[PDB]
Amino acid sequence: SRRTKKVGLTGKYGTRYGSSLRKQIKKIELMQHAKYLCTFCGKTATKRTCVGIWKCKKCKRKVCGGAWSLTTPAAVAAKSTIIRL
Amino acid sequence: GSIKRFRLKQRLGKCRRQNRPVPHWYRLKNTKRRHWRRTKLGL
Amino acid sequence: IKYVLDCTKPVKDTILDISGLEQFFKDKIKVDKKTNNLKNKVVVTSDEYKIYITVHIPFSKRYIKYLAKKYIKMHQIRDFLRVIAKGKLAYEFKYFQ
Amino acid sequence: PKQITDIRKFLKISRKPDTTAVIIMKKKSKTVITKLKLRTKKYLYTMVFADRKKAERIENSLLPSLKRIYYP
Amino acid sequence: SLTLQKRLAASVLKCGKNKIWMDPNEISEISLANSRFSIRKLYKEGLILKKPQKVHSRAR
RNA sequence: AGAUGGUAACAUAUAUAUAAAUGAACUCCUUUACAUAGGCUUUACACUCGGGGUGCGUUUUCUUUGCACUUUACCUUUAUAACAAACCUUGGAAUCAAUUUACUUGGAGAAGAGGUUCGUUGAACUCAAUUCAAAAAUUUGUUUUGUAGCAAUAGUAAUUCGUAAUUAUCCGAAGUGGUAAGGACUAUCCUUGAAAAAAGGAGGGAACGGCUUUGUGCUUUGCUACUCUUAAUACUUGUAUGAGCGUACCAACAACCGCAUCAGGUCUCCAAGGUUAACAGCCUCUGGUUAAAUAGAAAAAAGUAGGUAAGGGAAGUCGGCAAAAUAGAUCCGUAACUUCGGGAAAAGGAUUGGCUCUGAGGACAUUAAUGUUAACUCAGAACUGAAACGGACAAGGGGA
RNA sequence: GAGAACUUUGAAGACUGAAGUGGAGAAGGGUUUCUUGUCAACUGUGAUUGAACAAGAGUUAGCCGCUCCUAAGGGAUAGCU
RNA sequence: UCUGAUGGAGGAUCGAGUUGAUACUGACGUGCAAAUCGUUCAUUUCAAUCACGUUUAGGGGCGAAAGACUAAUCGAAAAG
Numbered sequence: 025s026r027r028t029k030k031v032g033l034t035g036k037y038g039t040r041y042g043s044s045l046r047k048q049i050k051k052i053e054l055m056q057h058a059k060y061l062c063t064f065c066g067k068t069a070t071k072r073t074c075v076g077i078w079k080c081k082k083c084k085r086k087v088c089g090g091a092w093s094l095t096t097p098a099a100v101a102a103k104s105t106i107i108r109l
Numbered sequence: 110g111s112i113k114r115f116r117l118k119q120r121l122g123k124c125r126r127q128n129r130p131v132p133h134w135y136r137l138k139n140t141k142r143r144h145w146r147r148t149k150l151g152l
Numbered sequence: 153i154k155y156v157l158d159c160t161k162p163v164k165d166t167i168l169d170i171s172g173l174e175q176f177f178k179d180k181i182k183v184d185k186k187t188n189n190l191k192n193k194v195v196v197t198s199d200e201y202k203i204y205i206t207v208h209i210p211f212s213k214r215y216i217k218y219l220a221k222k223y224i225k226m227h228q229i230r231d232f233l234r235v236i237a238k239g240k241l242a243y244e245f246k247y248f249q
Numbered sequence: 250p251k252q253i254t255d256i257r258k259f260l261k262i263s264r265k266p267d268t269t270a271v272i273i274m275k276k277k278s279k280t281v282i283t284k285l286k287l288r289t290k291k292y293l294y295t296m297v298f299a300d301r302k303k304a305e306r307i308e309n310s311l312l313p314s315l316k317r318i319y320y321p
Numbered sequence: 322s323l324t325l326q327k328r329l330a331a332s333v334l335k336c337g338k339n340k341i342w343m344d345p346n347e348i349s350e351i352s353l354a355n356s357r358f359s360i361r362k363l364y365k366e367g368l369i370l371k372k373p374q375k376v377h378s379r380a381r
Numbered sequence: 382a383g384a385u386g387g388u389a390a391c392a393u394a395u396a397u398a399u400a401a402a403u404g405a406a407c408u409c410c411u412u413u414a415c416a417u418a419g420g421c422u423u424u425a426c427a428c429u430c431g432g433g434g435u436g437c438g439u440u441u442u443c444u445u446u447g448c449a450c451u452u453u454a455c456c457u458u459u460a461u462a463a464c465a466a467a468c469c470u471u472g473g474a475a476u477c478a479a480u481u482u483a484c485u486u487g488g489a490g491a492a493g494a495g496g497u498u499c500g501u502u503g504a505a506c507u508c509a510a511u512u513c514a515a516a517a518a519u520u521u522g523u524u525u526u527g528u529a530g531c532a533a534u535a536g537u538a539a540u541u542c543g544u545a546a547u548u549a550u551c552c553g554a555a556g557u558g559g560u561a562a563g564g565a566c567u568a569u570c571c572u573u574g575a576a577a578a579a580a581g582g583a584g585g586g587a588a589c590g591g592c593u594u595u596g597u598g599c600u601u602u603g604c605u606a607c608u609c610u611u612a613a614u615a616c617u618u619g620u621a622u623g624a625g626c627g628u629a630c631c632a633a634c635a636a637c638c639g640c641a642u643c644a645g646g647u648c649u650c651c652a653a654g655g656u657u658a659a660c661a662g663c664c665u666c667u668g669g670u671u672a673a674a675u676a677g678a679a680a681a682a683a684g685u686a687g688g689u690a691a692g693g694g695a696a697g698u699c700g701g702c703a704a705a706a707u708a709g710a711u712c713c714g715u716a717a718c719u720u721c722g723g724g725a726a727a728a729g730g731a732u733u734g735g736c737u738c739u740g741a742g743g744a745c746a747u748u749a750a751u752g753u754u755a756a757c758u759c760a761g762a763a764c765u766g767a768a769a770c771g772g773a774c775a776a777g778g779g780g781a
Numbered sequence: 782g783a784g785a786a787c788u789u790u791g792a793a794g795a796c797u798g799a800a801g802u803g804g805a806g807a808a809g810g811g812u813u814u815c816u817u818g819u820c821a822a823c824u825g826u827g828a829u830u831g832a833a834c835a836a837g838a839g840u841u842a843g844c845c846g847c848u849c850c851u852a853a854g855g856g857a858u859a860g861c862u
Numbered sequence: 863u864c865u866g867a868u869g870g871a872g873g874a875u876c877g878a879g880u881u882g883a884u885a886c887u888g889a890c891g892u893g894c895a896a897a898u899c900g901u902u903c904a905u906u907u908c909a910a911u912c913a914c915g916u917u918u919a920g921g922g923g924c925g926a927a928a929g930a931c932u933a934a935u936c937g938a939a940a941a942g
C-alpha cells in the first residue's frame with residue numbers, strides 16, 4: 025500500500041513545520057535524494073555527498089554541482105555560452 | 110591522589126615529620142600539630 | 153563394565169549388613185525411570201565385603217554413591233560413614249576420620 | 250616458546266653453545282609421553298615424543314655439559 | 322580481636338570474609354596467628370574453614 | 382654494480398633468529414587519522430543446557446537427585462582452517478542474472494570455474510608429528526600421540542600419608558544473545574566529523590669492488606676472494622643495557638568539598654540467577670554489611686509516613702488541591718477536526734491463571750521415503766477453581 | 782575486659798541485591814594504610830572499638846603511567862606600541 | 863492507482879537512568895541540609911548530557927535575556 029498521498033519524503037517531519045514549508049522541502053528533498061545520471065560512466069549513480077559535491081558510486085568521480093540538484097540552470101547556461109564561444 | 114609530583118610528595122613527608130610530638134626527654138631540660146582530617150595542608 | 157563397593161570397614165564392625173544392601177540396590181536401581189527392571193541390563197552380586205554392579209546401560213558411578221548414602225540414612229549410619237572413590241570403578245566406605 | 254619437529258634441527262640447536270639447560274618432562278598420557286625442552290638464550294624450544302625409548306636415546310645423545318632439569 | 326586473622330584468611334583462601342569460619346573453641350590458638358603462613362597452617366588443621374556456599378538451586 | 386618465482390592478483394630468505402632482495406639529492410603518497418544513526422553478521426566473554434568424573438547437601442516420604450569444581454594467560458610474522466570483503470585469470474551474460482535482513486552489482490565484463498590478498502579470529506582444520514606401505518626426481522593410505530608450543534611443573538576440587546610428600550581429576554556434545562570488539566554495508570547533514578611526532582611505501586637513479594706499486598683526495602700499472610647481512614667474541618676509546626619521577630590508603634558508607642565522623646554534592650569501567658519487553662520494580666547467588674550522633678519500656682493525645690471505610694459521590698474548596706480510579710499484553714473498535722503527516726493508546730469494548738493436549742514455524746544426512754536433532758515464539762481445544770488470573774511488583778484517568 | 786545493646790568469635794534471623802556500603806581507578810585528601818601498644822580528650826549513648834593517642838613500620842617497573850607529539854589554547858623571540 | 867510485506871526516517875511517541883524541579887504551596891524550617899527529604903512530576907539521539915582541558919574579568923565579562931550568572935557575594939564581585 026502506498027502510504028502517504030501528498031507528503032512523500034516529508035513524512036519524517038510529521039505534523040510540525042508549516043505545510044507550505046514541507047511542500048518546498050519536498051521539491052528540494054526529491055532533488056537531493058535522486059540518483060542522477062553520471063556524465064562519465066553513464067550509470068545513474070551520482071548521489072550527493074556534501075552540499076555542492078556529487079559522487080558517482082561507479083567511477084568515484086566527485087562532480088561539483090548544485091546544493092540540491094546536480095546541475096543548476098544558470099550554470100548550465102554559462103557552460104552553453106562557453107561552448108558556443 | 111595516587112600520582113604526585115616529587116616536590117608535592119616531599120612536602121607531604123615534611124608535614125608528616127612536623128606532625129610528630131615533642132620527644133619526651135626534651136621536656137626534662139606541641140601547639141602546631143595538625144590532624145589530617147580537621148585541618149588541611151592546603152597544598 | 154563393573155562398579156564396585158568395598159564395604160569392608162563397616163561390614164567387619166557388623167554395622168553394615170550386605171544382604172540388606174543388595175536388596176536395597178535391587179529395589180532402587182531405576183532403568184529408564186522404573187525400579188523393578190535390572191533385566192539383561194544390570195547385575196548385582198556380593199562377596200562377604202564387596203558388592204559388584206555390572207552394567208550394559210548408560211549408568212553413573214554417582215548413582216551408586218547416592219544409593220549408598222540413602223541406605224546409610226535409612227539405617228542411621230550417617231555421622232560415622234562416608235562413600236569415597238578409590239579407583240575409577242571402585243567406591244569404598246570410609247570412616248568419618 | 251617454540252616447538253621443534255625436525256629431530257636434526259633440535260640436535261643442531263643443542264650443539265649450539267648458548268643452550269644452557271635442558272628440561273625433560275614425563276607425562277601420563279590419556280603410556281609415558283616425554284617433552285624435551287631446550288632453554289636457549291632467546292627461546293625455549295620443545296619437542297614432543299610419543300615413544301619413550303626414542304626420547305631416552307635422544308636424551309643420551311644430548312651433550313653432557315647441559316644442565317639437565319628433571320621436572321616431576 | 323580476630324579481625325586481622327579473618328582478613329588474612331580471606332586472601333589466603335580466596336573467599337570473602339563473609340565466608341570464613343573461625344572455630345569458637347580455640348579462639349586462643351587462632352589469635353596467635355599473625356601471619357599468612359600460620360593462617361595456612363590453621364586451615365590445614367581445621368581451625369579455619371571456608372564455609373559452604375549458600376545454595377542457589379536451578380531446580381524450580 | 383645490485384636474487385628469483387607466479388599468466389596475474391601477488392608470493393619467496395623458516396639461518397638458534399625470515400637477519401640480508403644496492404640505493405644519495407630531491408619529490409609524492411600512505412599509515413598515524415577519526416561524525417552520528419540503523420540494523421545484519423562474525424568471534425570472544427557471560428549465561429545456560431545435557432552427559433561423564435570428583436566431593437559436599439537432602440533423605441518420615443519422594444528425588445539416576447540439588448550444589449560446588451571440572452581451569453588455561455601474553456608470547457610463537459603464532460602454523461593452518463573458516464568467513465565478509467577487495468582484486469586476478471578464465472568465461473561472455475536479455476527469456477536479464479547474481480544477490481542482501483536492507484540494496485547492491487554487471488560489456489568500465491556479470492554468473493559459473495579456479496586463484497591472490499587484507500581483515501577478523503588465534504589450534505579451527507587431520508593442524509602438526511609419528512606408524513608402516515605404494516608412486517615421482519617427493520605425493521596417497523592406515524595408526525598412535527600432542528589440552529600445538531606456552532602447559533602442568535601452575536591453578537581448582539578431591540584423596541590420603543607424614544610432622545612437607547604421594548596419588549586420582551581436569552572432558553565429549555549444544556543452546557541463549559546480555560556485554561564488548563571487529564566486519565561488510567545502508568542512511569542523515571545548509572552538521573561531512575582534529576592535528577602532529579613517528580613510521581612505512583613508492584618515484585628517482587647520486588655513488589660504487591679490495592689489496593700492492595708509481596706521480597701530483599686524483600690518475601696510471603698488476604693480482605683475485607669481494608660487497609652485504611644478522612649473531613657472538615676480542616681489544617683500545619671516560620666506566621658501552623634499560624635514566625628520573627609516581628606506585629601505601631580512602632574515593633565517601635566516617636579518609637574529598639559542604640565550619641563536622643553533615644540523609645547534600647562529586648567523573649569513569651566491570652556487572653550474576655529468577656520474574657520481565659527491560660541494565661525497570663520485586664526476590665535470590667558471588668562479594669559486602671547486620672552499621673548508621675543512643676538504647677530500653679510503655680503504647681494516650683498530638684504529629685508525621687501510611688492503610689481501610691456503610692450509603693452518597695465534589696455537596697468540600699479559590700480551584701477535584703490530595704487521594705482514588707486508569708494502566709501490561711492480545712484481539713476488536715477508533716469521532717470531530719486536520720497543515721492529510723496526525724488526532725490515536727482517541728473514545729469504548731472483550732480476553733488474560735493452572736493443568737492436560739493439539740496444530741504451525743528449522744537445521745543437518747542418508748537415499749520421493751527414512752533418520753539424528755534445536756530453539757524459543759505463535760495459534761487453537763478440553764478440564765480446572767469460592768469467577769480468579771498483567772493476582773505481588775510494575776503500570777495513561779478520559780472526554781467536550 | 783574493672784566494666785560490653787553498638788569490641789571479637791560462633792549460632793540464628795535479616796538487608797545490600799551487580800545502576801550494590803561489591804571490585805578497580807580519576808579529581809581531592811595525605812599517611813587516614815599496616816602491626817604492636819592503647820584510652821586524657823575526641824569517636825554528640827556506651828566503648829575494652831576507632832579514620833583518636835603513642836611507638837615503630839610500609840609504596841620496589843625498560844613493558845602501568847608521567848616522560849615524547851601535537852589540539853583548543855598559553856608564555857615568549859623580532860619588531861611595533 | 864490500490865493491497866501485503868520489506869525498509870527503518872524523525873530536534874516522532876512512552877520510558878528506567880541521567881539532567882532537572884511541576885505539584886503536594888507534603889515533610890523539614892533552633893533542619894541531615896545557609897535549599898535537604900519524600901512521593902508526584904518534566905527530560906532521554908539531540909539546540910542532548912557529563913568530564914577534563916581551555917578562552918573571556920569588574921563599569922568588565924558571559925547571558926535561547928531572568929538584570930540572570932560572574933566561588934553562599936551582583937540593578938555593578940572580592941581584596942586591600
Ligand SMILES: [Mg+2]
Binds near residue numbers: 110112
Ligand atoms: Mg593531587
Ligand SMILES: [Mg+2]
Binds near residue numbers: 146
Ligand atoms: Mg573536610
Ligand SMILES: [Mg+2]
Binds near residue numbers: 533
Ligand atoms: Mg597440578
Ligand SMILES: [Mg+2]
Ligand atoms: Mg594501590
Ligand SMILES: [Mg+2]
Ligand atoms: Mg557523607
Ligand SMILES: [Mg+2]
Ligand atoms: Mg572550608
Ligand SMILES: [Mg+2]
Ligand atoms: Mg568494601
Ligand SMILES: [Mg+2]
Binds near residue numbers: 673
Ligand atoms: Mg553518619
Ligand SMILES: [Mg+2]
Binds near residue numbers: 690
Ligand atoms: Mg465511602
Ligand SMILES: [Mg+2]
Binds near residue numbers: 694
Ligand atoms: Mg459515580
Ligand SMILES: [Mg+2]
Ligand atoms: Mg460551600
Ligand SMILES: [Mg+2]
Ligand atoms: Mg462548589
Ligand SMILES: [Mg+2]
Ligand atoms: Mg491530583
Ligand SMILES: [Mg+2]
Ligand atoms: Mg555510635
Ligand SMILES: [Mg+2]
Binds near residue numbers: 796798
Ligand atoms: Mg534482600
Ligand SMILES: [Mg+2]
Ligand atoms: Mg529493598
